[PDB]
């Protein structure tokens, strides 16, 4: 007598949907699991018509190949959830159901936010289209880069290095993600000198420059104190670690950003703790839809070339999920439900770390124009030449695409040619004597 498993229920459009994958313990039948998961996340107690509030588990299927793994689909009434509150959404869905003694492992795979609920969130403070008009950057991805090292570098000097980069032809620069306010680099100082670099480099290049200032702080009070002061300096962009800081603190910051027209970069520190394992946790695909909802203009989607296949398809999927307005359900790219966004603006995926210049044509063919290609560390001539190299390589790539060339099959040449014009680009390319495997012939 289990009213939490309804195999015939066709979901309403206004429902919230969730796809879990689970390994049931020896003995537990799959329908017992999906129902318990449904009950716990919703009502769960076991004269009214409660039916409205009870979350229903409406479909169960075994994962192709994998033995002892099932997908469980659950529908949630629009009334279960507080507005604008991802926090509440999370607490409702991932709050408890992960601890079940009758479950070996549970992983949340995707969520269908109903348009009716999406409408109650602010979303990105600006989003792709607005931000291009704000920065005046069009027709190409955006170039950023990270400064190494972390601390052990004075404000005056960090700032100097930031200037060297931006002046060398890069759009953005970023604080190391564990840089907040330590015994030898208090934020107020980092902010002063970074601001100075932007203003100078910007005037010198005649191009809009920005550095993501890490306002991530201990308290909401402190976090605001910094954003407030980054505003005072006329900075166009700040960064925030949405996961380690938390979703409440973020929702707050993302609104403030819209009010002060400050762009909001989002670093996913500590994501790997949750999203790494195939069998347990939450997938980054979900956290990304969440980060879209709470708020933010950029978001680190990780690179697609260091990591291999299956990240590829899954990453392409959720890049689409944070960029577009309507996303067709496609299981092969890891998209479980069709997602709409009702004209909620898109988030710029940020391809971060482990990537150097050679990757450039690939990155452009994969991510296209609406991306941020970060480049942290290192060119044999310094920051500026390194920046120039990366910049020319990019400019060369875009035009080669627009001319109509195959960035996979021709990536090599498109760079080698451009290199005959930028000695900085030459030095960099020549730094990587690349390896190719041919089998023995004759």
């Amino acid at each position: 007598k289990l009213t939490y498993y309804t195999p015939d229920y066709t979901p309403k459009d206004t429902d919230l949907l969730a796809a879990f994958r689970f390994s049931p313990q020896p003995g537990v039948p799959a329908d017992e699991a999906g129902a318990a998961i449904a009950a716990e996340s919703s009502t769960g107690t076991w004269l009214t018509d409660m039916d409205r509030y009870k979350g229903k588990c409406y479909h169960i299927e075994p994962v192709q190949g994998e033995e002892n793994s099932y997908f469980a689909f659950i529908a949630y009434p629009l009334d279960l959830f507080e507005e604008g509150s991802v926090t509440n959404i999370l607490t409702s869905i991932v709050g408890n159901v992960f601890g079940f003694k009758a479950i070996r492992s549970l992983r949340l795979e995707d969520i269908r936010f109903p348009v009716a609920l999406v409408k109650t969130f602010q979303g990105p403070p600006h989003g792709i289209q607005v931000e291009r008009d704000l920065l005046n950057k069009y027709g190409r991805p955006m170039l950023g880069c990270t400064i190494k090292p972390k601390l052990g570098l004075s404000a005056k000097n960090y700032g100097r290095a930031v200037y060297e980069c931006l002046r060398g032809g890069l759009d953005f620069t970023k604080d190391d993600e564990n840089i907040n306010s330590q015994p030898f680099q208090r934020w107020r100082d980092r902010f002063l000198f970074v601001a100075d670099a932007i203003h100078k480099s910007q005037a010198e290049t005649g191009e809009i420059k920005g550095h993501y200032l890490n306002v991530t702080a201990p308290t909401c009070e402190e976090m605001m104190k910094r954003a407030e002061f980054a505003k005072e300096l006329g900075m166009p962009i700040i960064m925030h670690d949405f996961l380690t800081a938390g979703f409440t603190a973020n929702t707050t910051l993302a609104k403030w950003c819209r009010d002060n027209g400050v762009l909001l970069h989002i670093h996913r520190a500590m994501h790997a703790v949750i999203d790494r394992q195939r069998n347990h946790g939450i997938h980054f695909r979900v956290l990304a839809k969440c980060l879209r909802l709470s708020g933010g203009d950029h978001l680190h989607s990780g690179t697609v070339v260091g990591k291999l296949e299956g990240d590829k398809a899954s990453t392409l999927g959720f890049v689409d999920l944070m960029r577009e307005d309507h996303i067709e359900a496609d299981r092969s790219r890891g998209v479980f439900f069709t997602q709409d966004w009702a004209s909620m603006p898109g988030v710029l995926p940020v391809a971060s770390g482990g990537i150097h210049v050679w990757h450039m044509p690939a990155l452009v063919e994969i991510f296209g124009d609406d991306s941020v290609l970060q480049f942290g560390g290192g060119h044999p001539w310094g920051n500026a030449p390194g920046a120039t190299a990366n910049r020319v390589a990019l400019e060369a790539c875009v035009q080669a695409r627009n001319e109509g060339r195959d960035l996979y099959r021709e990536g090599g040449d498109i760079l080698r040619e451009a290199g005959k014009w930028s000695p900085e680009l030459a030095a960099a390319l020549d730094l990587w004597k690349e390896i190719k495997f041919e089998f023995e012939t004759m």
């Binding site: 291999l308 296949e309 299956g310 041919e438 089998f439 012939t441």
Partner: protein
């Protein structure tokens, strides 16, 4: 990761078995038709690397020649593929312990001289 590695090895093997299918028809046609076997040798020189970019090049010129190798590469793999895995693993395992043995003997040569 491993799902990616095997998908690669299979496509490389499929490209290398295309090379070996060309080498058998060239040996079987190196006697029956020397002039035409000489032409095929000239055209395919350096085009061996990609198996599917080679067949698309031979279909664009001599269609009868491309379909032949297709039947040949299909016959070879349906015959020799079954035996492959055993030979690779025990081949590597042999090679490996042999390289380690020689390393331990090289280790002991640096041992007693120290």
């Amino acid at each position: 990761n491993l799902k990616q590695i095997a998908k690669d090895t299979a496509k490389t093997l499929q490209s290398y078995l295309t090379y070996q299918a060309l080498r058998t028809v060239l040996a079987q046609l190196g006697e029956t038709n020397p002039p035409l076997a000489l032409w095929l040798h000239n055209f395919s020189a350096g085009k061996v690397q990609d198996g599917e970019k080679y067949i698309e090049e031979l279909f664009l010129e001599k269609p009868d020649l491309a379909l032949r190798i297709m039947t040949v590469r299909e016959h070879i793999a349906e015959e020799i593929a079954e035996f492959l895995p055993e030979m690779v693993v025990t081949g590597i395992q042999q090679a490996n312990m042999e390289k380690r043995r020689q390393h331990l003997e090289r280790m002991t040569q640096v041992s007693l001289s120290h």
